[PDB]
UniProtKB/Swiss-Prot annotation:
Residues 41-65 are annotated as: Acidic. Forms a complex with host RAN and probably binds to exportins carrying activated MAPK in order to mediate the hyperphosphorylation of host Phe/Gly containing nuclear pore proteins (Nups) resulting in cessation of active nucleocytoplasmic transport. Proteins with NLS signals fail to import, cellular mRNAs fail to export, and some proteins small enough for diffusion are not retained anymore (efflux). The resulting inhibition of cellular protein synthesis serves to ensure maximal viral gene expression and to evade host immune response. This is Leader protein. The lineage of its organism: Viruses, Riboviria, Orthornavirae, Pisuviricota, Pisoniviricetes. The chain holds residues 1 to 67 of 2293 of the full protein. The modification Phosphothreonine is found at residue 51. It comes from Mengo encephalomyocarditis virus.
């Protein structure tokens, strides 16, 4: 958090000691669109959200920290 930044961008790294676009909730914002279909992959209907019980637990199928090309 504000280590050696000042140039312009100050979100290149989320407060999670890592890239912002490399986080979940970060990608949950809907910054992806490989297939511009409002989605990419999934197989788990909406429900018990991320502790938000908002009703939407989109299964991160074919889209993880490795399952993004393999299986
Ligand atoms: Zn983040």
């Amino acid at each position: 958090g504000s280590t050696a930044m000042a140039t312009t961008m100050e979100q290149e790294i989320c407060a999670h000691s890592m890239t912002f676009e490399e986080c979940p909730k970060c990608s949950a914002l809907q910054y992806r669109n490989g297939f511009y279909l409002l989605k990419y992959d999934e197989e788990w209907y909406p429900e018990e959200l991320l502790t938000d019980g908002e009703d939407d637990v989109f299964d991160p199928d074919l889209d993880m920290e490795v399952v993004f090309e393999t299986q």
